[PDB]
Amino acid sequence: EHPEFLKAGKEPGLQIWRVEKFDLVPVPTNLYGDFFTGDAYVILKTVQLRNGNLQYDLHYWLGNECSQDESGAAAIFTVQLDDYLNGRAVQHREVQGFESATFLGYFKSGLKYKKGGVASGFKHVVPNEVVVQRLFQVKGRRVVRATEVPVSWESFNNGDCFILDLGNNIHQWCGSNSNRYERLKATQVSKGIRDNERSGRARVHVSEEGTEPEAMLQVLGPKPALPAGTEDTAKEDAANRKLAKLYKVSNGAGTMSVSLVADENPFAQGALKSEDCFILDHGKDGKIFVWKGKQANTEERKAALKTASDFITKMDYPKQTQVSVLPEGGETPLFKQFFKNWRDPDQ
Amino acid sequence: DETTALVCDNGSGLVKAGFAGDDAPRAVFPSIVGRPRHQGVMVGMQKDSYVGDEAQSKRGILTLKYPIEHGIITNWDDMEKIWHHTFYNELRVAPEEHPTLLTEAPLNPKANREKMTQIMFETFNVPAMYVAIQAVLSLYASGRTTGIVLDSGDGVTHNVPIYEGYALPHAIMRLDLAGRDLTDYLMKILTERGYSFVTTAEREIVRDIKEKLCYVALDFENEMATAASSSSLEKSYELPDGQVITIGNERFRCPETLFQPSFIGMESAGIHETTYNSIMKCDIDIRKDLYANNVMSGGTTMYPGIADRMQKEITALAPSTMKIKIIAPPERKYSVWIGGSILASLSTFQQMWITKQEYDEAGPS
Ligand SMILES: Nc1ncnc2c1ncn2[C@@H]1O[C@H](COP(=O)(O)OP(=O)(O)OP(=O)(O)O)[C@@H](O)[C@H]1O
Ligand SMILES: [Ca+2]
Ligand SMILES: [Ca+2]
Ligand SMILES: [Ca+2]
Ligand SMILES: [Ca+2]
Ligand SMILES: [Ca+2]
Numbered sequence: 038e039h040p041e042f043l044k045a046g047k048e049p050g051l052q053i054w055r056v057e058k059f060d061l062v063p064v065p066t067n068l069y070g071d072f073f074t075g076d077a078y079v080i081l082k083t084v085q086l087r088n089g090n091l092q093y094d095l096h097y098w099l100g101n102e103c104s105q106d107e108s109g110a111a112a113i114f115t116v117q118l119d120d121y122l123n124g125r126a127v128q129h130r131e132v133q134g135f136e137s138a139t140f141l142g143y144f145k146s147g148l149k150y151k152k153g154g155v156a157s158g159f160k161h162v163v164p165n166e167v168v169v170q171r172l173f174q175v176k177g178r179r180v181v182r183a184t185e186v187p188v189s190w191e192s193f194n195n196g197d198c199f200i201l202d203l204g205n206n207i208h209q210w211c212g213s214n215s216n217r218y219e220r221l222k223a224t225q226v227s228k229g230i231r232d233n234e235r236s237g238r239a240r241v242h243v244s245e246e247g248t249e250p251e252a253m254l255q256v257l258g259p260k261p262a263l264p265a266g267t268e269d270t271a272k273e274d275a276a277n278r279k280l281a282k283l284y285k286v287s288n289g290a291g292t293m294s295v296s297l298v299a300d301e302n303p304f305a306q307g308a309l310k311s312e313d314c315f316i317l318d319h320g321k322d323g324k325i326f327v328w329k330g331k332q333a334n335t336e337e338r339k340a341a342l343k344t345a346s347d348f349i350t351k352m353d354y355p356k357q358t359q360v361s362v363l364p365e366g367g368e369t370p371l372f373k374q375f376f377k378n379w380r381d382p383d384q
Numbered sequence: 385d386e387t388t389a390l391v392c393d394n395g396s397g398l399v400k401a402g403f404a405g406d407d408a409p410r411a412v413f414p415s416i417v418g419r420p421r422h423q424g425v426m427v428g429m430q431k432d433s434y435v436g437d438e439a440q441s442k443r444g445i446l447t448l449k450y451p452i453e454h455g456i457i458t459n460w461d462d463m464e465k466i467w468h469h470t471f472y473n474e475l476r477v478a479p480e481e482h483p484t485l486l487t488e489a490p491l492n493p494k495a496n497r498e499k500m501t502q503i504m505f506e507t508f509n510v511p512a513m514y515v516a517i518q519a520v521l522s523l524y525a526s527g528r529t530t531g532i533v534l535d536s537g538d539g540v541t542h543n544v545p546i547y548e549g550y551a552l553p554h555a556i557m558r559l560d561l562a563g564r565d566l567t568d569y570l571m572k573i574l575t576e577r578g579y580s581f582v583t584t585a586e587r588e589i590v591r592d593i594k595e596k597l598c599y600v601a602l603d604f605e606n607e608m609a610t611a612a613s614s615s616s617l618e619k620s621y622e623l624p625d626g627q628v629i630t631i632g633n634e635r636f637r638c639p640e641t642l643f644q645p646s647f648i649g650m651e652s653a654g655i656h657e658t659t660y661n662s663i664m665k666c667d668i669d670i671r672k673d674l675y676a677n678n679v680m681s682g683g684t685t686m687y688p689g690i691a692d693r694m695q696k697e698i699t700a701l702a703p704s705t706m707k708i709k710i711i712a713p714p715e716r717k718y719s720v721w722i723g724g725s726i727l728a729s730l731s732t733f734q735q736m737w738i739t740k741q742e743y744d745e746a747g748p749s
Contacts, residue, residue: 038735039731039732039735042732059405059726059729059730059731060730060731061731061732077527097527097529099527105525105527105722105726106725106726106729108526108527109524109525109526109527109722109723109726109727110726110729110730111527112524112527112528112529113524113529113726113727113730114730114732115529115549116529116548116549116550117732119548119549120549124548128529128530128548128549130527130528130529130530158405158729159405159406159407159725160403160405160406160407161406161407161408162402162406162407162408162409162410163407163408164400164402164408164409164410164411164412164718165410165411165412232438232441233473236411236413236436236437236438236473236474237436237437237438237439237440237441237442238413238437329478331478331480331509335481338481339385363476364471364472364476364477364478364479365478366468366472367471367472367473367476367477367478381432383432383433383465383468384431384432
């Protein structure tokens with residue numbers, strides 16, 4: 038608590054730790070002096086003072102090739118160690134090839150630098166980056182639903198709408214024979230992806246036959262003659278009505294039950310209740326959603342997650358099926374589309 | 385599972401938000417809440433807000449408020465929804481499942497930190513949280529425990545001498561001059577030239593011009609003379625609706641304000657003077673290390689040349705033999721956040737969380 042802090046430093050001597058993936062790991066004892074240039078270390082020296090208590094010196098050493106997390110951690114570990122020694126230790130920053138004379142005098146043979154070291158702890162991100170290229174068919178008679186299809190002109194027809202999502206840019210495209218309800222849904226979902234999925238950091242471009250932009254053609258290739266299409270039948274509508282099922286994971290009644298709430302679309306928003314988790318299985322399209330209620334307990338959450346991902350293999354869904362997990366209030370458009378009249382809480 | 389910590393760095397102009405153990409914040413968005421504009425007499429009790437980048441995108445039909453002023457939270461209602469938007473939209477996570485690290489302005493009043501903590505536990509239900517001083521994290525990021533930081537953002541600039549891990553509070557220096565001001569001044573300066581930069585829309589184009597073509601002159605009055613000799617130093621810039629505008633000495637006159645706050649009518653000492661003054665408020669025995677570890681932080685320190693200026697200016701102010709170093713890390717827009725990501729990932733930090741239970745047993749603390 039922490040085990041390495043407990044060991045340090047209780048008597049005269051020299052201790053050396055290497056920073057490894059956010060941790061303080063003691064250096065093999067006959068390796069003291071060997072220093073990896075890709076790495077960062079912390080060194081405590083303890084001297085016996087003739088008055089009974091001890092003098093501490095903390096030196097954190099930084100190789101010319103060490104990653105920022107390691108040098109940052111090395112530094113912070115130094116202060117946490119000094120604090121644990123009631124601020125009674127003197128901190129020295131030691132840069133490779135510029136080490137303090139006092140530091141050098143801790144090693145009777147002199148340091149030996151070593152190429153390489155342990156991989157950085159950082160996962161790497163570029164802020165606000167999104168890499169997305171996907172295509173949607175927005176289709177229905179009166180019950181329009183968005184469903185994913187290959188990124189090619191072959192998916193297109195002059196009778197439905199399509200959302201070509203490229204990250205910062207969303208192409209909403211409707212064919213001339215697309216009915217009134219498909220148009221609203223195209224717009225609803227496009228704005229959803231932009232404002233909600235991309236936090237407003239995206240631009241929607243509306244298009245149709247003969248207006249489609251450079252960047253759309255850049256992906257899809259040169260526009261061929263598009264088919265059709267057949268009008269939407271009330272029978273196709275009732276199919277969209279059965280596209281997804283809605284389960285409730287709860288143990289509120291003493292035991293873990295996964296109940297089927299609804300198999301008919303659109304679901305009632307009211308059905309998603311905060312004390313529990315829910316799964317919206319749209320697995321055929323490769324999408325299962327795990328809705329965590331803010332008051333659902335931790336076991337309910339792990340179960341929902343487990344159940345959701347069992348479905349992929351139980352129902353032989355086409356992996357790479359994506360299980361997205363949604364916090365209450367953090368719901369996404371491709372999941373909000375299955376509800377009757379979504380009401381945005383704070384409005 | 386196993387649980388990841390959230391690091392969220394709330395600043396006057398921008399929220400830098402993400403998961404501990406990353407290089408960088410995953411989400412970086414304007415620190416603004418916008419409601420739909422209304423004109424005149426008042427009738428009702430209202431409705432919806434928009435937060436962050438969606439507010440930028442929708443500004444043409446809304447009025448934008450800033451929850452953080454000069455690095456301090458002053459609007460709790462709107463700060464609540466800046467956090468809501470971070471948790472549920474930008475990171476898209478359940479806050480109840482992640483320990484959360486938050487940053488604060490240096491000298492942040494006790495009552496601010498206590499409200500912040502209250503809101504996290506009582507409205508957001510986080511399992512644990514910790515508050516870190518912005519500047520201190522930045523120092524850690526560069527792998528130092530001793531040094532003096534210049535943090536300068538959109539709304540505030542600070543000088544924070546730090547020794548052996550902790551800031552020396554009486555030597556801390558706060559100057560209410562940062563990005564927004566510089567941006568406002570560039571708007572002014574360009575308008576005097578003969579362009580039209582007044583509207584808040586135009587304030588966004590100028591921010592871009594500011595951050596793309598401005599630099600700090602190594603020597604101001606020399607550069608003025610270069611600018612009056614040739615077009616050599618001039619840059620061109622294209623407006624969306626436009627059309628091209630020419631920019632000249634305003635390129636360097638704008639950031640100059642940091643060293644000469646009278647450019648905008650401020651009685652204050654310049655950032656070089658406030659640095660020196662800060663070092664001088666410290667124990668004589670530690671000044672030597674303060675001078676050799678000037679670490680730079682915040683988007684407003686990004687100006688090309690600023691490091692060489694700090695160097696020239698500080699050299700001038702200090703004892704003749706004093707070793708002076710200016711450290712300007714390439715990724716300094718995010719030093720504060722990186723500092724947090726590293727601290728929150730450490731094996732030993734687990735001990736430092738204020739847990740929910742511990743909260744429900746004392747007056748924040
Ligand atoms: N290359 C650049 N040149 C000049 N200024 C820049 C550059 N990049 C970003 N900025 C400025 O940095 C500011 C944002 O920086 P930062 O995120 O550190 O501030 P903040 O934390 O939001 O505010 P504060 O620290 O003042 O509370 C903006 O004013 C922006 O114009
Ligand atoms: Ca390493
Ligand atoms: Ca000490
Ligand atoms: Ca159709
Ligand atoms: Ca429950
Ligand atoms: Ca800041």
